[PDB]
Amino acid sequence: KIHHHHHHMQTFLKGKRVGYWLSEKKIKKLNFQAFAELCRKRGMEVVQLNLSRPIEEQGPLDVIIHKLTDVILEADQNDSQSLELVHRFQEYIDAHPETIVLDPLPAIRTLLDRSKSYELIRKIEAYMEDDRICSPPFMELTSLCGDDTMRLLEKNGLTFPFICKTRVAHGTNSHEMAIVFNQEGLNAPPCVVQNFINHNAVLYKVFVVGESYTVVQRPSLKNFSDRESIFFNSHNVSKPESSSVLTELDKIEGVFERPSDEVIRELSRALRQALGVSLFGIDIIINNQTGQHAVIDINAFPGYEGVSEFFTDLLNHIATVLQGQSTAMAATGDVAL
């Protein structure tokens, strides 16, 4: 009852060349060298790219795998070195349409800004019109709180409690968040605000590798107010070993179910097809009042901690994308639901 296989498309991996750009920290966390070993066994060449060096000489490349997210974010902040790297990368990609990029920079850029990403998820969900899915109201606050803040929140469907997150979606200075419970709590901007959804303190990290995904359960904020706003760093909340009073559920309340694979599949397809990403995660929580799936976070090329099949899935996705290119499997028109 696994019906999709890759043995045949894996036969074309021989002689293919894969370039990757990952930070040394990410190479370590992934044990990416072990993936490189796996590919060599199928007759692939894998090489780490150096974006300080002309890229022509480093190719030909059939595929590039990267996580340039933070270099892009630095280049956005006018870091001269990062700009140089991105320009070089971009020049090369532009010159080599035959090179499959996992994932395209336009796709990456969508996930760099929380508000933009949440709006894309909202639009995608409106298009899918599945009553099993909900988009928590969200908005971006740019001005410091004041006399009009309450009415601004209200007209955008923001309610207490809501969680405050940075607009920048990754890197240094992206993990500090707040939960605001009442009007007095409104000193906690700029930031994105998103209605807090009680979900019985279980996060379902959907780790997507192209055509396959793995769901990994993580600790998550408890259910919840004259109380002081809560400030926390998301590093401390939803890691495998995370444990704190913020994630200790008092008791199961309301609807408590696991996510629907049918729903995850439709979300995965729609996000992949609309945005062009393939190596990403979406964080799903199950609303305890409605049972609906809420996507509260989307991340380009995350850690995949707990995804033991990550390497074989990655290899299968490289085989698939090569198969797609070889047979001109380009999508046309709108996302086909």
Binding footprint of ligand ANP on the chain (CB under 6 A): 136, 163, 165, 174-175, 194, 196-197, 203, 220-221, 234, 237-238, 283, 285, 296-297, 299
Is there a binding annotation on residue 201? Answer: yes
User: Nearer Cβ to Mn ion, position 125 or 283?
Assistant: 283
DSSP string, 241-270: T---GGG--S---S---PPPHHHHHHHHHH
Q: Is 92 known to sit in a ligand binding site?
A: no
Contact 316, 6 (CB under 8 A): yes
Tell me which stretch binds Mn ion (CB under 5 A): 57-65, 246-254, 289-297, 310-318: 289-297
Q: Is 35 annotated as a binding residue?
A: no
Q: Using the minimum distance from each CB to ligand ANP, give the nearer residue, 52 or 159.
A: 159
The answer to whether 247 contacts Mn ion (rule: CB under 5 A) is no
Compute the least distance from the CB of residue 136 to ligand ANP, in Å: 5
The separation between the first and the last C-alpha atoms of the chain, rounded to the nearest angstrom, is 23
**Burial of residue 242 (number of CB atoms within 10 Å: 0-12, 13-18, 19+):** middle
E strands in the chain: 17-21, 45-48, 63-66, 100-102, 133-134, 138-141, 162-165, 176-180, 191-195, 202-209, 212-219, 230-233, 279-286, 293-300
Is 165 labelled as part of a ligand binding site?
yes
Q: How far is the CB of 205 from Mn ion (least distance, A)?
A: 7
Q: Which of 125, 266, 283, 313 binds Mn ion (CB under 5 A)?
A: 283
User: Has 203 been labeled as part of a binding site?
Assistant: yes
Residue closer to Mn ion by CB (options 58, 238) is: 238
Tell me the C-alpha distance between 271 and 252, whole Å. 31
| Distance set, CA 71 to CA 21, 159, 287 (Å) | 11, 35, 35
Task: Give the nearer residue to ligand ANP in terms of CB position, either 124 or 221.
Answer: 221
Under rule CB under 5 A, residue 140 binds Mn ion: no
State which residue, 69 or 320, has the beta carbon closest to ligand ANP: 69
CA 247 remoteness from chain centre? 22
Min dist CB 331 to ligand ANP, Å, is: 27
Q: Which residues are within 8 A (CB) of 204 and not within 5 positions of it... i.e. 6 or more apart?
A: 215, 216, 217, 218, 258, 259, 283, 284, 285, 286
Contact criterion met (CB below 8 Å) for 36 and 64: no
74 binds Mn ion (CB under 5 A): no
| 114 is known to lie in a ligand binding site | yes
Is 297 part of any known ligand binding site? yes
Q: Note whether 93 and 21 are within 8 A (CB).
A: no
292 annotated to a ligand binding site: no
Residue whose CB is less far from ligand ANP, 15 or 240 = 240
Q: How far is the CB of 170 from ligand ANP (least distance, A)?
A: 7
| 99/198 with CB nearer ligand ANP | 198
Residue 231, Cβ neighbours under 10 Å: how many?
A: 11
With CB atoms as reference, the residue minimizing the distance to Mn ion is: 297
Binder of Mn ion out of 69, 299, 316, 320 (CB under 5 A): 299
Tell me if 297 contacts Mn ion by CB under 5 A. yes
205 is in an annotated binding site: yes
Q: What is the dihedral of CA 154, 156, 160, 166, to 10 degrees?
A: -130
Q: How many angstroms separate the CA atoms of 98 and 83, rounded?
A: 24
* Residue ranges at the known binding site for Mg(2+): 283, 297, 299
Q: Which residues bind Mn ion (CB under 5 A)?
A: 283, 297, 299
* Residue ranges at the known binding site: 26, 114, 165, 175, 194-205, 220, 234, 238, 283, 297, 299
